Amino acid sequence: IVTQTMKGLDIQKVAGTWYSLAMAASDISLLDAQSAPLRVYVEELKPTPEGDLEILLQKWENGECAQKKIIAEKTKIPAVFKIDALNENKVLVLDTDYKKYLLFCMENSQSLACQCLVRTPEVDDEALEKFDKALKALPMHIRLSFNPTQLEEQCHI
Amino acid sequence: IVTQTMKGLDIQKVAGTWYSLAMAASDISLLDAQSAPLRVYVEELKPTPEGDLEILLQKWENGECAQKKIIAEKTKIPAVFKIDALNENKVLVLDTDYKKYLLFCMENSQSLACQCLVRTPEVDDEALEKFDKALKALPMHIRLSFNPTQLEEQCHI
Ligand SMILES: CCCCCCCCCCCCOS(=O)(=O)O
Numbered sequence: 137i138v139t140q141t142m143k144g145l146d147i148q149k150v151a152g153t154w155y156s157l158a159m160a161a162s163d164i165s166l167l168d169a170q171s172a173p174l175r176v177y178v179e180e181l182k183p184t185p186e187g188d189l190e191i192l193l194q195k196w197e198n199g200e201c202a203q204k205k206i207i208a209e210k211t212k213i214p215a216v217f218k219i220d221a222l223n224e225n226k227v228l229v230l231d232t233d234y235k236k237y238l239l240f241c242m243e244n245s246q247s248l249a250c251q252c253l254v255r256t257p258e259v260d261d262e263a264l265e266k267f268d269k270a271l272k273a274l275p276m277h278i279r280l281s282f283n284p285t286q287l288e289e290q291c292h293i
Numbered sequence: 294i295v296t297q298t299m300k301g302l303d304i305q306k307v308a309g310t311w312y313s314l315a316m317a318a319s320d321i322s323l324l325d326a327q328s329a330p331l332r333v334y335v336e337e338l339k340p341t342p343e344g345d346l347e348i349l350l351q352k353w354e355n356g357e358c359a360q361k362k363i364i365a366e367k368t369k370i371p372a373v374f375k376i377d378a379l380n381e382n383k384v385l386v387l388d389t390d391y392k393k394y395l396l397f398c399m400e401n402s403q404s405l406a407c408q409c410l411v412r413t414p415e416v417d418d419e420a421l422e423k424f425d426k427a428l429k430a431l432p433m434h435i436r437l438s439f440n441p442t443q444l445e446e447q448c449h450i
C-alpha cells in the first residue's frame with residue numbers, strides 16, 4: 137500500500153535512541169486498546185554490520201509494560217525490512233534526516249500502521265507535518281500523538 | 294479554548310439524523326477505551342421550540358451499547374449550549390451547512406473533544422477537510438474516523 141520509500145537510505149545512520157511521537161493505523165483496533173497489536177513504543181534502533189535492523193521497543197501486554205527485542209531482516213530494497221515472526225510483516229522507511237526524525241510504516245500481507253519517530257522528547261511540528269503529509273492518502277482511521285511528559289514514561293503512560 | 298463558532302446559526306435547521314464520521318480529543322484517554330468518557334455516537338438532534346437542543350446518542354457503557362438522551366440548554370450565544378449534568382460542559386457549534394455536515398466541540402471547565410457529523414453514512418472528504426482545518430491549532434492528541442459499514446452499526450462496531 138505504501139508507495140513512499142526513502143531513496144539512498146543509510147541504515148547505519150538511524151542507529152540509537154528514538155521516541156514514538158505519533159502513530160497512525162488503517163484500522164482503529166490496531167491502536168485502540170492499551171495492549172493493541174501495533175501499539176508499540178520504539179526505544180532504540182541497532183543496525184547490524186550486515187545491514188539488518190535490531191529494534192528495542194516497549195509494548196503493553198498482560199497488564200504491564202513489557203520489553204521487546206525485534207529483528208528486522210534486510211531485503212534487496214534498502215528502505216524495506218522483513219520482521220522474522222509468523223507472517224513476515226514489512227517495515228518500510230519513508231523518510232529520515234537521521235538527526236531529528238524518521239517516518240516508517242509496518243504492513244502485513246491488509247493492515248498498516250505508521251509512526252513519526254524523533255530523536256528527542258519534544259513535539260516537532262515540522263516532523264509531524266511531514267508525517268501527516270505522508271499519511272494523507274493512506275487509509276488511516278486512528279491517530280495518536282504524545283506529549284513530552286508521556287515520551288519520558290514507559291509505554292507513554 | 295475553541296474560538297471558532299458559527300455565525301447566524303439556525304438551530305432548528307440541524308434537526309434530524311446525523312452520523313459521527315470522525316472524532317478527536319485533547320487527551321488520548323477521552324476516546325481511547327471503547328467506553329471512554331467522550332466516545333459518543335450521535336444519533337439524532339431534536340431542537341425544542343424554545344431553542345434548547347435534545348440529543349440522542351449511543352455510548353459504550355458496562356460492556357454494552359447504551360442509549361442516552363441528553364439535553365443541551367441554550368445560552369445567550371446561538372452557537373453555544375450547556376449540558377445539564379454535573380459540571381455544565383459546553384457544546385460549541387463551529388460550522389454547518391445543515392444539509393451535509395456539522396462540526397461541533399465539547400469542553401469542560403481542561404478537556405475537549407470535537408466531531409465531524411454528516412447526514413449520510415458516507416465518507417465526506419470535504420467535510421473531513423473542514424474538520425481537520427478547524428482542529429489544526431486545537432491541542433488534539435487522538436483522532437478516530439469511521440467507515441460506512443461502522444456508521445450503520447450500533448456504537449460503530
Ligand atoms: C526504522 C524501523 C522503525 C522501527 C520498526 C518497528 C517495527 C515494530 C514491529 C512490532 C510488531 C509487534 O511487536 S511485538 O513485539 O508485539 O511482536
Ligand SMILES: CCCCCCCCCCCCOS(=O)(=O)O
Pocket residue numbers: 307330331333335338348352361362363376384386395397399
Ligand atoms: C450540535 C450538537 C452536537 C451534539 C452534541 C453532543 C454532546 C454530547 C455530550 C455527551 C457527554 C457524555 O454523554 S453521556 O451520556 O455519557 O453523559
